[PDB]
Every structure is written in structure tokens, then in C-alpha cells.
């Protein structure tokens, strides 16, 4: 029930969030333009998770 | 897919009548259903197409002990709604028991429009909570429709009655409805008779003929909530893809309303979003917070202005979400129709999931708890007692709606990741 | 010119009083990435209530130094940006001296925010009426008036009298020379020149003492009383050092009149 | 932050009426409230912004048993002031006791504008000292407002009555008011009926209709005292930075008025700074000395003249002062509006803290001391006796105002570093 499902849930949720970090952080090095980060990272959500370097 | 609307009860038949009349005027439809000679819209979903351009809407009108429905029949628009589907107490139990005997013929009336359409996605109910005949029958029909159509989804344009608190069994009736809706309604849009009345006293001097004038206030919301479906666009060209953003968790499917020009009788998009977030434009009467907000604007809107407006609203912070999720304000755009007045050239509406509506659920729950301790109106009528000897469906309704209140406040809590 | 004055020389109110007010709310690794300082300007032009034009863009809020960690210094630039047929007149060395006067004006804004914070911080203390309260609040009134008169000097010279020239002076080479004179009078009257630099050196002592007064927001009254006495001594020294530099500049003639009015 | 003005009493409602009518003329406003067509100023602070540009003032009008208050209502400007916030004896105790019963609804009227604005900095009271209904009620409201709103800063445009001394209980009323104002007012601007009357005899031949014309003098002072807030500036755009230089110690918060052209109906700043320091233009009737002086000039001022003029005023020494404060005269500059006439375009006002207002406080104190020895008008009315059986708030008021008089003369003394 959960042995086959929640195992696929957490490994996908961690893989989603990591690639969601890498989309935001690689778009944040791009200094209109930087607003795609701050739209995705609206009012306090996921705008400070892991600072690169 | 095409939408069939199940307007029921006297109040619900009133608002469905006015809703289809306003779509008659807004679209290119005459009172006889004929295409207008003076007339770019997606009329397929809401209006059935006859060969002589009789745009008859897929309205299902249910009359139980009919009075208002006779007045509905002697109208100039009686030729417009002709799918020939009108089939002949103030208690919830009386309405339920009266619906049970005629369920098969009213369901065959559902089946005929389901066969006659190419396809069907949703059942949009003009439901009246605690509406005497409308309440009870609407809960029973709501319970039948999800069983018969399990893939399909049901919306409820609930007119939640708050009239400063005549029906003495109104909290009991409303209590049973909200249990049936919480388990058996995919979506609910909430409206309030007190809030529409306070807005009536605000924008006009109307106090005594409150219902007749609030019908127009309800109908403007009901049209603007569907305009992005009724007219094409880039996005939100399906009900269900609109619905998913407004309802993030299945238990909290209740949606508040608002309109930027309440007096809709140039304004930039920054101005109309800021005006919408203020509480005077909201039509609904511990920390509390939104779960997700959406907005739709119709009119002469500059396109690059709306992203600067989203940035501007983000800096204004007039409403702050703070749920467990990434929910953001979502800008959407539609076209204002021709042939009707373009007054207030830019004009908008919002739909949102807010935890403040749980206080309103708790108000009729508090009235019910006091009335349930008193037992002043158990009604003891032989319909009421023979239908519920145990009177325990009220207690199941109380525990289900108490779960709903606790779920709302748990959504306010930082941990809705755990079970609410 | 009348737009860069609105933004760089801080003439337009509700913009400097919002940008500086937003930046001073924080005070290292934070307040230096381009996520907050490159966005606080797009937050501040919104509450300007004057601007949001094509002139109002090209306000690159950049930096020029990485601070490590009570002082009166916070280095930060604010550069305008132009296009081709105007870049030939507004020189690229002129906007650098605009930054040079801008840092001093923002440093002046720091005083009227922090002293406002100690004026507001004492308001919640009020029943508590005694010796140690009223004799303390007299120091805030004595120290505020100095900042409010030196700022009025700056606000008469660098924004009004040097703007009456170069506005009634204009109405191709003469545009270059007239701009190079307008700025040069703006930085000459601003006490930023190396000729009158000791006069500027005393102002840092005054400003640092007011910052130390903001630190002690009556457990440590006498520690603040000594600081006030040092303030009074330094102001009394400034009145003599400005008077000795009258014999050797008609721009400084206003300053002795500003600081001294029915006193010695 | 936006300023809400609490005009109260008949005289205070008169001067607030005229103040907002003058700001309607001076700004781009019409008697309906909407902006005029022909209209770069900061109208945000003083005027609320409606959706269709109906710049409505944030005026709170309080009335008490209204008979002549309806004259405010039958005006062309009644649509201009529409926040709908007007809620229904000649003794201080009568006004206090009448205010106590309606305090909650008038405070909810305060709360509504408090929520409706973005923000609030100050409550500016058009108060009438010893004004029958206005006195007493204004003292009670002034006592409530600092408790409920301690962060905000209160101003009082006190029209101190001196009419060559009809109200026989006028020193008692004024005595109680000044206790409340010294304790619960962050700043007070003083004005005098006899000084404006002597100015009226000077400039014109008007003697019998003194109040109706003195309204215009008071309104010119009241407008020019806030012009640097209403119109944009480099400095002192907030009210707090203006207030703090004028009021150096919290007890002495009383401010003198004067205007450079005593008839305003070219002049250099040497002349218009000189004219403020002449006693004929001052609008107020042992060594004595100012504590701090400030001036604001209007129009297209030549500015190198203000270097020359500040040095010239220093050499002239027309203003004599040597207080504990540093007391440098501060010069300010503002713009004359682009609507009103340019005749006498250069036009200036002064606000200053002067120790000579203590003599005026002592005058009504001397009248009170004589009347208190005589006990000729203790009033003995059952309101006055039941409210004040001990009659000891008059003695508490007397010791507080006597502290104020002694503080003013200690301010004249060289040692106000020690306790006054």
C-alpha cells in the first residue's frame, strides 16, 4: 500500500525539489528577467532554501 | 464538454433564471432563443445548438410545490429555455423525502440532456442552503449524481443564508446540507445574504427589497466566474483546469467572491487589483490566511502592465497567503463582450480559498449547538421523526462539519503536511 | 537634469525617505546579493509617487565594495544611465562625482532616521517622570537641532542656489562647460572639497557621537551624559574652526550664520 | 501617514469647515468632491482618494444637540466632505458628561477612518477652549485618544478665547481644558480672539461681525501652517520633523502665530523675514524670550537673498531671545499654488515658542483665582455638583497650570538644565 507507493513518492518529491532548486538557482545567476524566480518564489516560499556558495 | 445546470428550489430557480437571462443579453441571444441580428464566443459549452439557432441552455428546472416556477413560465424568455424538463415543505427532511419518490423521473430528465449533448463534464447546482424545499432535495440529488457519474464533478453555487438570523430550523437544515456537500461536492462557491445586503446598503439605499436586488449582485458574480470559459483564451479554457488551482485540498473546496467595481454602473490593472484586495469589495461577511488566490480581469487591459501589477501587488502585500504551499496570486485576462455597456471599461472579480469562511460555518454550527441543547425545534413532525427516529444524522453532520472547522484551522497551522 | 536631480540628489521626497528607510531597517552576507538591493529600488520607485517614466528606469543600484561588518559609513552607489546622443554631453566622469556627493547625502539621512528612532523609542517608556528622564530628553533636543541646521544648509546650497544657475544660464561646447560648472559648484558648496576638508573631518566626530547615543536606547545614564558632554565640546570647537577659515570662501559665510545664531 | 482632523464644537466645526473649503479651492477640488478639469502636490495626506477621484477629506465632525450644525449640511460642499461620520450645555462638565455616553460610537467613527487609510500619523483637533459643548468634550476625547493611539501625535489648533472678558464660567472651563491639554496634547497652536480682532481693526473697519471675518484669518494661518506638508518638499515632508524643532521641551508645546503681509490682498526675503519680527503682524495679544523660531516662505523666492537675509536678520536682531535651547531661527521655503492669485506671491508665516503666552495663561488663571475666591459661579448645577462634588479637579488643574507658568519663567531663567 505504502511500501510501493510512498517509496516512489518521497524519491520523486526529493527529485522534484532538487531540480526545482536547480531551475531557480541557475536562473538566479541571470542577474522582467529575474522575476521568473520571484514569481515562482512568491511571498516567502522557497526563496531561501540553499544559498549557492 | 458541455455544462448542464441543475437549478432547484424557489431561490435557486430565481438565480438560475436571472443567470440565463443575463447570458441571453450578454451573448447574441434574443428572448426567443433566436440568434440576434445585430451580432466570437464559445457558446457551445453553456448553450445547446438547434438548427434554427435556438440557443436553448441545458437548464434543468426542478419545482417542488411550485409557486415561483409558474411566474418563471409566464415570461418572455419561456421560449428560450425550452428543453421541456420541468417536473412537479420548509424542512430538510421533507425536501429529502419528497425528492426520493420522484428521483427516477428527474434523473431521466438528467439522462436525456446527457445523451443529447456530445459530452458532459459538470453539474453546476443553483443550490439554496436551508432553502426549505431546495435544501434536502439538493442534498439528495447531490448524493445521487456522484454515484451515477463517478468520473464527473459537481459545482455548487451555494447561497449560504445569513440574514442576521424566518426559519427556526435553519441551522438544522444548513447543518445537514453542509455534511452532504463536504463529502459529495467537488466544488462549492459560497455567497452570503448579509454580505450582499451590506453591499446593497453601501452602494445603494436599498434595504427592504433586499432579495430582488441581490439577485443581480449574485448574477454578476455567476457570469464573471464563467466568462473565461464562455469566451476563449490562452488559458483557463476548461472548468477543471480552472478548478484545480482554486481547490488545493479536497475537504476545503469553499470559495469566496469579490468584485472590483461593485458600482460597475480609465482604471489600470494595478488599481483594480489593489481595489479587489480591500475588504469592502469582498462579498463575504488566532492567525487567519488565504490558501490560494486567483483573479480574472475583463476589459481594455494593457498586457505588459499586468506583470508590473503582479510585482506591485507583491510589494503592496494587501493580502498574504502564508499556507504550507507555493500558492501565489494568479493573473488572468478575458475580453469584455460587445453590445452591452462597456462602463467601467476595466472590471474584475476574484475567487479565493480563505480560512475566514470557517467562522461562518461555525456560526450556524453555534446556533445549531444552542438549538440542539434546547431541543426547541426538533420539529417532531411525523415526517421528521419517521424519517430520523435516531436524529443521529444531525450528529454525524456535526462531527463532519467539526472536522471541517478543525481542518481549516489546521490549514492555518504550519503543519498541514500531517493529517488535518 | 531635472529628473536626475529628482533621483540622485534626493530632491524628490518620499523616495529617499523610503529607500534609506528600507535599507536602514536591516542593519554582512545579507544586504549584498542582487536579490534584495536590486529589488529594493523596484520597491522604492513604486512609493516615490513621482516618476515611473522612461527616465525613471536605468537606476542601477549597484555597489563598489564588500563590507565585512556603530560607525557612520555604508558605501553604496547609485548610477544613472543614458543612450548615445546624450552620452556625448553628460560625461562619464560627471556621474561619478554625482556618486561622490550621493554617499554624503545618504549618510546624512542615516542621522535623521536613527535619531528619529531614539525619539520614538523613548515614547513607549511613558508615570516615569523624574530627574533622569527629562534631563536625558533635553540631550536629544540639543543634538537634533545641529543635524537639522546643517541639513538645511545643504538643502539651501546644493539644491537651490546652484540650481538657479545652470537653469537660467542655459537659456554645443557650452553645454559641456556649463554642466561641468553646475556640478563643480554643487560639490564646492557641499564641503566635499579637499580645501575645506578639516571642516568635514569634525562632522564625523559629531555623527559618531549621535550613533553612540542611539546605541544606549536608567541603567547606564552617566555613560550617556559623558557622551553628550563630548558632543557639546566638539560643536563648540566647530564654531571656532569655521571662524578661523573666514580670513583665508563666501560659501562658508552662510555656515557660521547657520550654526551660530544668538550664541557664541 | 494620513492626517485625520477631529473638528468638534460649533466654533471648531466652523473653522474646520472653512479650512477644508480653503483647501478645496487651493487644491484641485470641486464642491462635489471630484477633481476639477483644469488641475504636482501631495494630496495623499490630507485627502482620501476615492475611485472616481472624489478627494474627500478625512474630517470627523462631532455635533452635540444640533440646531445650527445643519447649516454645515445645507452647503454646496456637503458632497465634498462625505465620510458619513456625523453623530448626534455651556459648561465644561456638561460637555464632558455628554461625551462620555457617546464615546464608543464616536470612537468607532475614529476607528473606521483608521482602518480605511493606509496609515495614520496624527489627530489634528479644531478645538475651542471654553467653547461650551466643545470644551469638556474635547478634553475627554483628547484623554481617550492618547490611551488608544499612543504612537500617533496629537495637534490642537486651540482658539484661545480672549474677547476682553458671555460666559461667566469661562475661566473655570478654560482652566480644566489646559490641564487636559498640557497632559494629553503632543503640540498646541494658540490663537487669540482679541489679537485677531485688533488685527481686524487694523487692516479693515470690521468691528461688530468679528467672528465671521476672523474665521478667514484663522483659516489662512491653518492652511499656511500645513502648506509644506500638503505640497512636496525636500525636507520636513513628515509632520514629526516639523513639530520637533518647534517644541523643545514636552511641557511647553504652545506655538505663536504671525503672517508677513497683514494685508496680502516685489518683496525680498530680507523684508518678509523682517516683517515677522514686528509685533503688528504677530497674531497673539522680568526678561522674556523666545525658545525657538521657525519661518516658512511661499512663492518664487530668490535664494541668494536668503543668505543675505539670514545674515541681515542676525545683524538686525529684531527677535530677542536667549533660552536654554539653542534657538537658531530656521528658514523654510515652499511653493505658492498654481490656482489662487499671484497678487502678493511672496507671502510668509512664522511659528515660534515664546514665553509671553504664559502671561495669557496667567490672565485666565487670575480671573479663575478671583472667581474661585468669590465662588460667584461654581454653577451649583446638579450636573456640575454630581460630576465634581470635591471641586478638586479645578485645584489639580490650578496646580498643573501653575507648574506650567513656573516652567515658562524657569525657561526664561539661565538654569533650565536644572528642574523647572
PDB file of N, CA and C in Angstrom, chain B residues 275-329:
ATOM      1  N   UNK B 275      -7.723  47.495  -5.434  1.00  0.00           N
ATOM      2  CA  UNK B 275      -9.102  47.705  -5.003  1.00  0.00           C
ATOM      3  C   UNK B 275      -9.790  46.384  -4.668  1.00  0.00           C
ATOM      4  N   UNK B 276      -9.476  45.324  -5.422  1.00  0.00           N
ATOM      5  CA  UNK B 276     -10.033  43.998  -5.159  1.00  0.00           C
ATOM      6  C   UNK B 276      -9.569  43.422  -3.828  1.00  0.00           C
ATOM      7  N   UNK B 277      -8.309  43.656  -3.456  1.00  0.00           N
ATOM      8  CA  UNK B 277      -7.819  43.052  -2.216  1.00  0.00           C
ATOM      9  C   UNK B 277      -8.376  43.712  -0.952  1.00  0.00           C
ATOM     10  N   UNK B 278      -8.999  44.884  -1.068  1.00  0.00           N
ATOM     11  CA  UNK B 278      -9.603  45.552   0.079  1.00  0.00           C
ATOM     12  C   UNK B 278     -10.881  44.826   0.516  1.00  0.00           C
ATOM     13  N   UNK B 279     -11.258  44.905   1.802  1.00  0.00           N
ATOM     14  CA  UNK B 279     -12.416  44.127   2.275  1.00  0.00           C
ATOM     15  C   UNK B 279     -13.779  44.691   1.895  1.00  0.00           C
ATOM     16  N   UNK B 280     -13.864  45.936   1.412  1.00  0.00           N
ATOM     17  CA  UNK B 280     -15.160  46.478   1.011  1.00  0.00           C
ATOM     18  C   UNK B 280     -15.674  45.824  -0.265  1.00  0.00           C
ATOM     19  N   UNK B 281     -14.770  45.344  -1.116  1.00  0.00           N
ATOM     20  CA  UNK B 281     -15.160  44.686  -2.355  1.00  0.00           C
ATOM     21  C   UNK B 281     -15.433  43.198  -2.168  1.00  0.00           C
ATOM     22  N   UNK B 282     -15.011  42.621  -1.041  1.00  0.00           N
ATOM     23  CA  UNK B 282     -15.311  41.227  -0.739  1.00  0.00           C
ATOM     24  C   UNK B 282     -16.785  41.094  -0.372  1.00  0.00           C
ATOM     25  N   UNK B 283     -17.440  40.062  -0.911  1.00  0.00           N
ATOM     26  CA  UNK B 283     -18.870  39.843  -0.729  1.00  0.00           C
ATOM     27  C   UNK B 283     -19.136  38.702   0.250  1.00  0.00           C
ATOM     28  N   UNK B 284     -18.267  38.547   1.253  1.00  0.00           N
ATOM     29  CA  UNK B 284     -18.397  37.542   2.305  1.00  0.00           C
ATOM     30  C   UNK B 284     -18.356  38.240   3.658  1.00  0.00           C
ATOM     31  N   UNK B 285     -19.313  37.914   4.526  1.00  0.00           N
ATOM     32  CA  UNK B 285     -19.395  38.535   5.847  1.00  0.00           C
ATOM     33  C   UNK B 285     -18.632  37.741   6.903  1.00  0.00           C
ATOM     34  N   UNK B 286      -6.165  34.277  16.968  1.00  0.00           N
ATOM     35  CA  UNK B 286      -5.655  33.308  16.005  1.00  0.00           C
ATOM     36  C   UNK B 286      -5.397  33.960  14.652  1.00  0.00           C
ATOM     37  N   UNK B 287      -4.294  33.562  14.022  1.00  0.00           N
ATOM     38  CA  UNK B 287      -3.981  33.994  12.668  1.00  0.00           C
ATOM     39  C   UNK B 287      -5.021  33.438  11.697  1.00  0.00           C
ATOM     40  N   UNK B 288      -5.264  34.173  10.615  1.00  0.00           N
ATOM     41  CA  UNK B 288      -6.103  33.685   9.533  1.00  0.00           C
ATOM     42  C   UNK B 288      -5.515  34.153   8.213  1.00  0.00           C
ATOM     43  N   UNK B 289      -5.704  33.339   7.178  1.00  0.00           N
ATOM     44  CA  UNK B 289      -4.886  33.482   5.985  1.00  0.00           C
ATOM     45  C   UNK B 289      -5.542  32.769   4.812  1.00  0.00           C
ATOM     46  N   UNK B 290      -5.227  33.253   3.613  1.00  0.00           N
ATOM     47  CA  UNK B 290      -5.695  32.614   2.393  1.00  0.00           C
ATOM     48  C   UNK B 290      -4.965  31.296   2.163  1.00  0.00           C
ATOM     49  N   UNK B 291      -5.572  30.432   1.359  1.00  0.00           N
ATOM     50  CA  UNK B 291      -4.867  29.231   0.934  1.00  0.00           C
ATOM     51  C   UNK B 291      -4.371  29.359  -0.505  1.00  0.00           C
ATOM     52  N   UNK B 292      -5.117  30.060  -1.369  1.00  0.00           N
ATOM     53  CA  UNK B 292      -4.738  30.412  -2.737  1.00  0.00           C
ATOM     54  C   UNK B 292      -5.710  31.461  -3.271  1.00  0.00           C
ATOM     55  N   UNK B 293      -5.200  32.386  -4.096  1.00  0.00           N
ATOM     56  CA  UNK B 293      -5.990  33.471  -4.685  1.00  0.00           C
ATOM     57  C   UNK B 293      -5.836  33.439  -6.204  1.00  0.00           C
ATOM     58  N   UNK B 294      -6.951  33.654  -6.908  1.00  0.00           N
ATOM     59  CA  UNK B 294      -6.969  33.830  -8.354  1.00  0.00           C
ATOM     60  C   UNK B 294      -7.802  35.065  -8.688  1.00  0.00           C
ATOM     61  N   UNK B 295      -7.470  35.718  -9.805  1.00  0.00           N
ATOM     62  CA  UNK B 295      -8.221  36.872 -10.283  1.00  0.00           C
ATOM     63  C   UNK B 295      -8.380  36.794 -11.796  1.00  0.00           C
ATOM     64  N   UNK B 296      -9.504  37.317 -12.290  1.00  0.00           N
ATOM     65  CA  UNK B 296      -9.793  37.406 -13.719  1.00  0.00           C
ATOM     66  C   UNK B 296     -10.246  38.831 -14.014  1.00  0.00           C
ATOM     67  N   UNK B 297      -9.665  39.442 -15.047  1.00  0.00           N
ATOM     68  CA  UNK B 297      -9.992  40.808 -15.435  1.00  0.00           C
ATOM     69  C   UNK B 297     -10.577  40.782 -16.847  1.00  0.00           C
ATOM     70  N   UNK B 298     -11.598  41.608 -17.083  1.00  0.00           N
ATOM     71  CA  UNK B 298     -12.232  41.717 -18.400  1.00  0.00           C
ATOM     72  C   UNK B 298     -12.302  43.189 -18.814  1.00  0.00           C
ATOM     73  N   UNK B 299     -11.570  43.535 -19.865  1.00  0.00           N
ATOM     74  CA  UNK B 299     -11.711  44.855 -20.443  1.00  0.00           C
ATOM     75  C   UNK B 299     -10.467  45.323 -21.163  1.00  0.00           C
ATOM     76  N   UNK B 300     -10.349  46.651 -21.266  1.00  0.00           N
ATOM     77  CA  UNK B 300      -9.286  47.329 -22.017  1.00  0.00           C
ATOM     78  C   UNK B 300      -7.991  47.312 -21.213  1.00  0.00           C
ATOM     79  N   UNK B 301      -7.385  46.136 -21.114  1.00  0.00           N
ATOM     80  CA  UNK B 301      -6.261  45.915 -20.214  1.00  0.00           C
ATOM     81  C   UNK B 301      -4.970  45.904 -21.027  1.00  0.00           C
ATOM     82  N   UNK B 302      -4.008  46.731 -20.613  1.00  0.00           N
ATOM     83  CA  UNK B 302      -2.687  46.732 -21.237  1.00  0.00           C
ATOM     84  C   UNK B 302      -1.913  45.480 -20.825  1.00  0.00           C
ATOM     85  N   UNK B 303      -1.254  44.794 -21.769  1.00  0.00           N
ATOM     86  CA  UNK B 303      -0.711  43.456 -21.464  1.00  0.00           C
ATOM     87  C   UNK B 303       0.560  43.465 -20.629  1.00  0.00           C
ATOM     88  N   UNK B 304       1.497  44.379 -20.897  1.00  0.00           N
ATOM     89  CA  UNK B 304       2.738  44.416 -20.125  1.00  0.00           C
ATOM     90  C   UNK B 304       2.506  45.051 -18.753  1.00  0.00           C
ATOM     91  N   UNK B 305       1.351  45.694 -18.565  1.00  0.00           N
ATOM     92  CA  UNK B 305       1.032  46.315 -17.285  1.00  0.00           C
ATOM     93  C   UNK B 305       0.742  45.277 -16.206  1.00  0.00           C
ATOM     94  N   UNK B 306       0.310  44.069 -16.591  1.00  0.00           N
ATOM     95  CA  UNK B 306      -0.217  43.142 -15.586  1.00  0.00           C
ATOM     96  C   UNK B 306       0.913  42.471 -14.814  1.00  0.00           C
ATOM     97  N   UNK B 307       2.089  42.320 -15.431  1.00  0.00           N
ATOM     98  CA  UNK B 307       3.197  41.728 -14.693  1.00  0.00           C
ATOM     99  C   UNK B 307       3.796  42.738 -13.725  1.00  0.00           C
ATOM    100  N   UNK B 308       3.882  44.002 -14.146  1.00  0.00           N
ATOM    101  CA  UNK B 308       4.232  45.079 -13.228  1.00  0.00           C
ATOM    102  C   UNK B 308       3.188  45.226 -12.127  1.00  0.00           C
ATOM    103  N   UNK B 309       1.918  44.942 -12.431  1.00  0.00           N
ATOM    104  CA  UNK B 309       0.878  44.930 -11.406  1.00  0.00           C
ATOM    105  C   UNK B 309       1.065  43.779 -10.427  1.00  0.00           C
ATOM    106  N   UNK B 310       1.517  42.618 -10.910  1.00  0.00           N
ATOM    107  CA  UNK B 310       1.766  41.492 -10.013  1.00  0.00           C
ATOM    108  C   UNK B 310       2.934  41.792  -9.083  1.00  0.00           C
ATOM    109  N   UNK B 311       4.009  42.372  -9.631  1.00  0.00           N
ATOM    110  CA  UNK B 311       5.120  42.846  -8.806  1.00  0.00           C
ATOM    111  C   UNK B 311       4.657  43.900  -7.804  1.00  0.00           C
ATOM    112  N   UNK B 312       3.816  44.833  -8.258  1.00  0.00           N
ATOM    113  CA  UNK B 312       3.309  45.906  -7.411  1.00  0.00           C
ATOM    114  C   UNK B 312       2.449  45.366  -6.273  1.00  0.00           C
ATOM    115  N   UNK B 313       1.591  44.385  -6.567  1.00  0.00           N
ATOM    116  CA  UNK B 313       0.747  43.761  -5.550  1.00  0.00           C
ATOM    117  C   UNK B 313       1.599  42.974  -4.559  1.00  0.00           C
ATOM    118  N   UNK B 314       2.660  42.323  -5.059  1.00  0.00           N
ATOM    119  CA  UNK B 314       3.614  41.630  -4.196  1.00  0.00           C
ATOM    120  C   UNK B 314       4.294  42.587  -3.226  1.00  0.00           C
ATOM    121  N   UNK B 315       4.592  43.807  -3.675  1.00  0.00           N
ATOM    122  CA  UNK B 315       5.168  44.781  -2.750  1.00  0.00           C
ATOM    123  C   UNK B 315       4.102  45.398  -1.843  1.00  0.00           C
ATOM    124  N   UNK B 316       2.859  45.536  -2.334  1.00  0.00           N
ATOM    125  CA  UNK B 316       1.797  46.119  -1.510  1.00  0.00           C
ATOM    126  C   UNK B 316       1.433  45.223  -0.334  1.00  0.00           C
ATOM    127  N   UNK B 317       1.396  43.898  -0.555  1.00  0.00           N
ATOM    128  CA  UNK B 317       1.108  42.884   0.474  1.00  0.00           C
ATOM    129  C   UNK B 317      -0.252  43.101   1.139  1.00  0.00           C
ATOM    130  N   UNK B 318      -1.263  43.473   0.345  1.00  0.00           N
ATOM    131  CA  UNK B 318      -2.592  43.739   0.893  1.00  0.00           C
ATOM    132  C   UNK B 318      -3.251  42.473   1.422  1.00  0.00           C
ATOM    133  N   UNK B 319      -2.906  41.324   0.850  1.00  0.00           N
ATOM    134  CA  UNK B 319      -3.280  40.027   1.385  1.00  0.00           C
ATOM    135  C   UNK B 319      -2.072  39.114   1.274  1.00  0.00           C
ATOM    136  N   UNK B 320      -1.788  38.378   2.343  1.00  0.00           N
ATOM    137  CA  UNK B 320      -0.650  37.471   2.376  1.00  0.00           C
ATOM    138  C   UNK B 320      -1.150  36.049   2.551  1.00  0.00           C
ATOM    139  N   UNK B 321      -0.586  35.145   1.754  1.00  0.00           N
ATOM    140  CA  UNK B 321      -1.076  33.775   1.696  1.00  0.00           C
ATOM    141  C   UNK B 321      -0.703  32.995   2.947  1.00  0.00           C
ATOM    142  N   UNK B 322       0.598  32.855   3.198  1.00  0.00           N
ATOM    143  CA  UNK B 322       1.284  32.012   4.191  1.00  0.00           C
ATOM    144  C   UNK B 322       0.614  30.642   4.428  1.00  0.00           C
ATOM    145  N   UNK B 323       0.330  29.800   3.363  1.00  0.00           N
ATOM    146  CA  UNK B 323      -0.016  28.413   3.673  1.00  0.00           C
ATOM    147  C   UNK B 323       1.222  27.536   3.661  1.00  0.00           C
ATOM    148  N   UNK B 324       0.980  26.235   3.728  1.00  0.00           N
ATOM    149  CA  UNK B 324       2.001  25.212   3.575  1.00  0.00           C
ATOM    150  C   UNK B 324       2.571  25.123   2.160  1.00  0.00           C
ATOM    151  N   UNK B 325       1.970  25.788   1.172  1.00  0.00           N
ATOM    152  CA  UNK B 325       2.334  25.574  -0.210  1.00  0.00           C
ATOM    153  C   UNK B 325       2.869  26.790  -0.946  1.00  0.00           C
ATOM    154  N   UNK B 326       3.139  26.617  -2.253  1.00  0.00           N
ATOM    155  CA  UNK B 326       3.747  27.691  -3.052  1.00  0.00           C
ATOM    156  C   UNK B 326       2.736  28.635  -3.682  1.00  0.00           C
ATOM    157  N   UNK B 327       1.513  28.656  -3.144  1.00  0.00           N
ATOM    158  CA  UNK B 327       0.389  29.361  -3.753  1.00  0.00           C
ATOM    159  C   UNK B 327       0.644  30.855  -3.902  1.00  0.00           C
ATOM    160  N   UNK B 328       0.365  31.358  -5.099  1.00  0.00           N
ATOM    161  CA  UNK B 328       0.638  32.732  -5.477  1.00  0.00           C
ATOM    162  C   UNK B 328      -0.626  33.342  -6.055  1.00  0.00           C
ATOM    163  N   UNK B 329      -0.639  34.672  -6.162  1.00  0.00           N
ATOM    164  CA  UNK B 329      -1.731  35.318  -6.870  1.00  0.00           C
ATOM    165  C   UNK B 329      -1.537  35.064  -8.359  1.00  0.00           C
TER     166      UNK B 329
END
